[PDB]
């Protein structure tokens, strides 16, 4: 039913508003808040959106240079277009670079979520901190934690929910991007102990359980069945599960991209098998989709057709 895509790390990517105009996209995850407070300058989080933003950064009130970008003008301009078009825009935390970020304590997990809520959530009279996207309010937060284990993330999720519940008139969302092996070293703890709305399983780069292994069963064993089972047991039991795929041949490691016809064979099986739990498709990522035109349309448009068929 829904199609989610990452944007922000594509080489020479088009600006976000280009993807705000793409009807087929339902959810866009903007990557990334990639530096975490415990190990970053000023103890502020830091951000990177590839070729976007003017390169300026915030300083702390004592003059310490942070890694949080302060001139993301096109992003600020573009998010409201996405939302006007009915898309959900989630700010993604983590991403694969750098490899050395984690959360060291319960207190800092809570403080990280508090900061992000203040900086990127609803505008509040009592916040005197940075507003990197101005008066824009994101639709929630994606946990793309790719290194260093699982500590802290459940606490962050729970903290965000407490905050969401103070704004009962607006819906916000939380998501996670585990890889396919169960247990997932970064996110099984958060999925077991806290409640995500969406979970997109990355079904590329691990041979044991990839989407490609549905097509060629000699490679591995595609394990969406196992993920349904593990979720029914978790605090995330009401999450919808998405199949995460590369949007071109070069978006991930060699051998993990599926043709539209291959995706249709997988999705038809699994959407039929799990009509309530199967949420849709997630794509890595917007620029690879856009650059992979098939019969005059980007890969993402072909994915939505499969989902609606
Ligand atoms: C290890 O793979 C990566 C290294 C650096 C930057 C991005 C990736 C990456 N490849 O597929 C991905 N998929 C997700 C959800 N997040 C990522 O960071 C990546």
Numbering used by the authors: 29 to 337
What did the authors write?
Chitin, a linear polymer of β-(1,4) linked N-acetylglucosamine (GlcNAc) forms the rigid inner layer of the cell wall and is also partially hydrolysed during morphogenesis.
Compound 1 consists of two ring systems, an isoxazolopyrimidine stacking on Trp312 and an attached methoxybenzene. The pyrimidine moiety inserts deeply into the AfChiA active site and thus is likely most important for binding. The 6-methyl of the pyrimidine moiety inserts into a pocket at the bottom of the binding cleft that is formed by Tyr34, Met310, Ala205 and Gln230. Residues lining the AfChiA1 active site form a number of hydrogen bonds with the ligand: the N1 ring atom donates a hydrogen bond to the side chain of Asp172, while the pyrimidine carbonyl group originating from the C2 position accepts a hydrogen bond from the backbone amine of Ala124 and the N5 ring atom accepts a third hydrogen bond from the side chain hydroxyl of Tyr232. The isoxazolo moiety points out of the binding cleft. It forms no direct hydrogen bonds with the protein, but engages in a (weak) water-mediated hydrogen bonding interaction with the side chain amide of Asn233 and the backbone carbonyl of Ala279. The methoxyphenyl moiety makes limited van der Waals contacts with the side chains of Trp312, Gln37, Phe60 and Ala124, but otherwise points towards the bulk solvent suggesting that the ring could be replaced. Strikingly the non-conserved Tyr125 side chain has flipped out to accommodate the methoxy group of the isoxazolo moiety and this may account for the improved inhibition of compound 1 over acetazolamide in AfChiA1 by facilitating tight interactions of the neighbouring pyrimidine moiety within the depths of binding pocket.
